[PDB]
Structure 1
Amino acid sequence: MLKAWHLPVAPFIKEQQERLMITLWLSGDDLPPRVTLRADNEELSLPMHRLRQAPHPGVVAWRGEINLVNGQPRRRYSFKLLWADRQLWFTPQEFNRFPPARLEQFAVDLPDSGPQWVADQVFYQIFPDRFARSQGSTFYGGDLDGISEKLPYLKQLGVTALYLNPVFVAYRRVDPQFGGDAALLRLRHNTQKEGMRLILDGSVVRHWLKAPWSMDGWRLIAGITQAAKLERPDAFVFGEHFGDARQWLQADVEDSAMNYRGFTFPLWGFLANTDISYDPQKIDAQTCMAWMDNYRAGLSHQQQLRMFNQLDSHATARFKSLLGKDVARLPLAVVWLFSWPGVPCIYYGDEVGVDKPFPWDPALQDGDLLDLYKRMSKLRKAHQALRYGGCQVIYAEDNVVVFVRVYKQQRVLVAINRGEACEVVIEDSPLLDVNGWQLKEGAGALHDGVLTLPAISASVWFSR
């Protein structure tokens, strides 16, 4: 049977001078004697050649290249496999018998003018009134100076970036109940001292990106983003879209979006049987991964890496409550939040099991859930594949999802099981052709092509 592999990341792509080297892996019995790379402002049919060296047993590699001197920075491409009498397309969504949509090709941004720092962050979203008062009707009285005082707690959590929502009285002034502008200036100063980024909910845009405010970005069209980039070239401008944000992302009017359609609601469906309307969902692993892969396909690799992933937000119920009787699935969602492409965003209180003022008393905190959050941010800070890697789903059937993050030689294997304990046969795969695997999270077992997965579990292996 014909198989193919390509991820818009090393080892499948490589820049060399002004040339983007692209590699396709194939396997099967009736291999195409020709493959063309379908890719300067016009659609081109670029020739590929077959390499002499098999990259993996039973795999032939084809290589082509795009000239980067001329063209828009977003490099779109797909693979046109050619036989004597027919053709087949390879895309981010497997094979296609008819041409893929232009906006559903593989894509890499070269050169990349997006905010390079976002992929390295772990964001924390704060509703200031309920987080921390600095040492009422519905004003609990927490403020920004409370946040400053809690910067050590968040540093220990793995947090590197704060997202404040709300901030302003809604030209633009910080709410006096949060400490006013003077408290915000202190919070900027203190997060800089801790190496933490700071993002505010919203030329007003340029003013708060100016010194001495020097905010790292805005949560909000293209004119706003362009003005934001003029004041601060690495400003992060992202949108809160509950629906399909792809049209905005595909026109580059925002750097990223809070990825409800591409991450949150698929997991609400697969893990909590519900959706944004609290209508019932009966979503198996096949459908969840088709959904998530279909959304991703419209995004360049760099865009995917900046997508804002969250289990819940100021606008939704807490995910822990949404799981209801199936609250044991919550750690599965935490592993997933930190291992899927994009930047994890923790809604304040999720890490201590809130389901309402933050419980600073350690006896009202779920310490095991808190430990898991610390472990995932550590694994993510230590392994480039969880921050910069491509993502390929290996297995999606009923209760079990298995995908691998791919970056240079590094592989991170993730196995998610929402149901009873089981064993799952994983076909031999050249993406999984490694020395061995080190189990670093979870209690699953990988041995002789077989995954042994405990009931209601998530497991992470790293290639050695």
Structure 2
Amino acid sequence: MLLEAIFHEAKGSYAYPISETQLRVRLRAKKGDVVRCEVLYADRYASPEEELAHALAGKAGSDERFDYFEALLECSTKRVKYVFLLTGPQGEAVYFGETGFSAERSKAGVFQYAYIHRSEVFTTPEWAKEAVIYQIFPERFANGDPSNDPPGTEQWAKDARPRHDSFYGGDLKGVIDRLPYLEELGVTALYFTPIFASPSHHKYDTADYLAIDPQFGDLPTFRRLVDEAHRRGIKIILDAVFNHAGDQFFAFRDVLQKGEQSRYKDWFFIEDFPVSKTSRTNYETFAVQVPAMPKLRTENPEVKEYLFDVARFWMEQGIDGWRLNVANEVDHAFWREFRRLVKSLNPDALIVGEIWHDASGWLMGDQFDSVMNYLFRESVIRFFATGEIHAERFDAELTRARMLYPEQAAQGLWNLLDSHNTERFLTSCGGNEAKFRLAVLFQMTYLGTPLIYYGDEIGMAGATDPDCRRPMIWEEKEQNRGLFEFYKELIRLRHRLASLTRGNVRSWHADKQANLYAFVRTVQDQHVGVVLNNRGEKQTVLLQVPESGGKTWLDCLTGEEVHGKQGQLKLTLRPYQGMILWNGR
């Protein structure tokens, strides 16, 4: 077996503690090469003339080239060491350790996890674990106070097809007036996009971090929303744009005035002075060269404390967490101290990061709790909507990303279908609601936090900005209540099955020819298995169901019942039908 292709490291995503006495270990190797992989360990200082402990590393999954094994090590003391024992297709074991590969346990070496400090155990909020959140674009959700509307605020109709200039008067007031609907849907939190004082129409160029933009509301109405949302089991996550600021930022506009004379000149990455010409950027901007957005020197103690204050202020109003905008561009130092702040000032506050590449570094339990699962959305779009990938690839992609980070974080990724920055999903699906529903079913059942884009729950359709940003349909008789109802159930069903919340995943069936997939979430003994038949035809499949831990399941959706013949579960699914089989456990 190709040992060059075998991996492990006493850290990060391959060696972390799941408590102050237990230690998780993952190891990978080529798909095929390894059959059995057991981990032999013992307390580090333990005397040589003693016995080692054992533990069978279970094959947790396989992507398009590797096989992943995972096993839990019991460390009564917080100190531990350990070596692997990888077997191949021909029972020819090998020992894997910090020194290399060798036949003799000793010559193999031994990995080491010095000590497991209780303060370094990845720990995320409890409500977070079982959430289901609703992304809200304030301006397009609901207008509850037409006074605050900006001039020429075009009319609010289902026939609207907004362009880059539209305004509709969406505000905080309406959001409050709709709390009832929101509550009915079953969401347990509302992640808002930016809402602080800003000139633009998106509010990403903060003008006053400490004040709600006028057109949306005021500190009173916000507290109103926070209080009114809370007493309904719904929390409030806000978009913190720390990477860069708005050119109306008090600090910045001063540097434009005073110049080198300003006490805030070293608060930005400015070229020379003059600064902020019509377009020629005489300073560093968050993007390629956007004028209205000068980068904030987050390494600077002044800048750092200012935002940390902007942080303490808003949490005083009772918000439950932050969605870190373009997080991957501020010093880990800042990000670490941020957590310490936020968390001392509130243990259940959630820090969700937005990184568009590998976020492993920020996900070691000392910075973000989770980040946007941009990977999930790709595997979802290409599998259900475009049909660019079959269920074997869909299994691969999902599985490879699942192994990307410590479970604490894996379990917390915000799985979304779309955003305000993308065409609506029902559109990506062509309009074939059969496909949409299927994807949603998967979303409401897969590992991680489902994130609902305002509107999709009842039928919205559209192209990336600004067509996806159409005004929310409230007219009872223009909302796909079938959908809305479909959502509610899934959502409730998700809250019910303690397996679909804190469980893990495991691939159960993949048929590249049938384009049918299926996985299994398991918490204790409880098993729930989702059978997704993604194809415009009716099919039948025999899912390997060892009669061991369950030989009869109930379809949580259509209540139908069913059992397994000789450990083989026969099933037939209507086109695009999806099945959620429970094992009662």
Q: Matches of 1:294 and 1:322 in 2, distance apart?
A: 24
The match for 2:74 among 48, 66, 69 is 66
Choose which of 111, 125, 144 in structure 1 pairs with 2:172.
144
Question: How is 1:63-102 mapped onto 2 (pairs within 5 angstroms)?
Answer: 65-67=73-75, 69-70=77-78, 80-82=85-87, 85-87=92-94
Cα distance between partner residues in 2 of 1:205 and 1:39: 44
Offset of 1:87 from its aligned partner?
4.1
Q: Percent identity?
A: 32
Which has the larger displacement, 418-427 or 124-133?
418-427
- Structure 1 residue 445: Cα displacement: 7.5
Distance in structure 2 (CA, Å) of the matches to 1:117 and 1:325: 34
Distance 1:445 1:181, change over 3 A: same
Report the equivalent of 1:456: 576
- Match among 522, 535, 541 for residue 406 of structure 1: 522
- Structure 2 partner of 1:191: 229
Q: Deviations along 1:223-261, whole A, 9 cap, x unmatched?
A: 333332232222211112333333322474211011011
State the alpha-carbon separation in 2 of the partners of residues 63 and 317 from structure 1: 41
Task: List per-residue Cα deviations over 1:378-432 (Å, max 9, x = no partner).
Answer: 11111110110011011122211110100111111101111021111212447x7
Q: 1:41 to 1:17 in 2, by over 3 A?
A: closer
The equivalent residue for 1:253 is 367
2:203 paired residue number: none
- Partner SS, residue 426 of structure 2: helix
Identify the match of residue 502 of structure 2 among 358, 377, 388. 388
Matched, 1:133 2:250: no
Among candidates 296, 307, 312, match of residue 204 of structure 1: 307
1:243 alignment partner, one of 333, 353, 357: 357
User: After the TM superposition, which residues 324-339 of structure 1 pair with which residues of structure 2 at under 5 Å, given as runs?
Assistant: 324=430, 326-339=432-445
Other-structure match for 2:294? none
User: Equivalents in 1 of 2:238, 2:79: separation in Å?
Assistant: 34
Radius of gyration: which is bigger? 2
Q: 2:55·2:73 contact (CA, 8 Å) conserved in 1?
A: no
Further displaced range: 239-248 or 292-301: 239-248
Match of 1:164 in 2: 192
C-alpha distance in structure 1 between counterparts of 2:122 and 2:506, whole Å: 22
- CA spacing shift, 1:324–1:17, aligned 2, 3 Å: closer
Tell me, in whole angstroms, the C-alpha distance in 1 between the residues paired with 2:128 and 2:144: 29
Question: 1:46-104 CA deviation, whole Å, 9 max, x = no partner?
Answer: 63169xxxxxxxxxxx99742164269xxx99974447632499xxxxxxxxx9xx9xx
- Between the two proteins, the alignment pairs up a number of residues equal to 401
Distance 1:291 1:19, change over 3 A: closer
Match of 1:424 among 541, 553, 558: 541
- Does 2:48 align with 1:48? no
**Given the alignment, which residue of 376, 383, 396 partners 1:290?**
396
Is 1:270 paired with 2:308? no
Report the AA paired with residue 204 of structure 1. L
1:312 aligned residue (391, 413, 418): 418
Q: Which residue of 2 aligns with 1:217?
A: 321
Name the SS for the 2:126 alignment partner: coil
Q: Which among 24, 38, 42 is matched to residue 35 of structure 1? A: 38
Partner amino acid, structure 2, of 1:134: G
Structure 2 Cα separation of the partners of residues 238 and 141 of structure 1 = 28
The residue type equivalent to 1:400 in the other structure is L
TM-score, reference length from structure 2 = 0.62
Give the letter for the 2:307 counterpart.
V
Q: CA deviation at 1:353?
A: 0.6
- Please tell me the root mean square deviation across aligned C-alpha atoms, in Å: 3.5
- Report SS of the residue matched to 1:215: coil
Alignment deviations for residues 8-63 of structure 1 (CA, whole Å, 9 cap, x no partner): xxxxxx999945699xxxxxxx996x932579899xx963169xxxxxxxxxxx99
Which letter does structure 2 place at the counterpart of 1:413? Answer: G
Contact kept? 1:209, 1:217, Cα under 8 Å: no
Deviation at 1:441, TM superposition (A): 1.7
Provide the rounded CA distance (Å) in 1 between the counterparts of 2:82 and 2:519. 23
Instruction: Classify the secondary structure of the residue corresponding to 2:183.
Output: helix
Contact 2:320–2:350, Cα closer than 8 Å, also in 1: yes
Distance 1:297 1:309, change over 3 A: same
1:320–1:353 CA contact under 8 A, matched in 2: yes
Q: Retained in 2: the 8 A contact 1:271–1:329?
A: yes
User: Residues 342 and 183 from structure 1, CA distance in 2 versus in 1: closer, same or farther, beyond 3 angstroms?
Assistant: same
- Give per-residue Cα distances to partners, 1:100-140, cap 9 Å, x unaligned: xx9xxxxxx99442222201221011101111111615221
Distance 1:353 1:78 in 2: 54
Between the aligned partners of 2:490 and 2:421, the Cα distance in structure 1 is 25
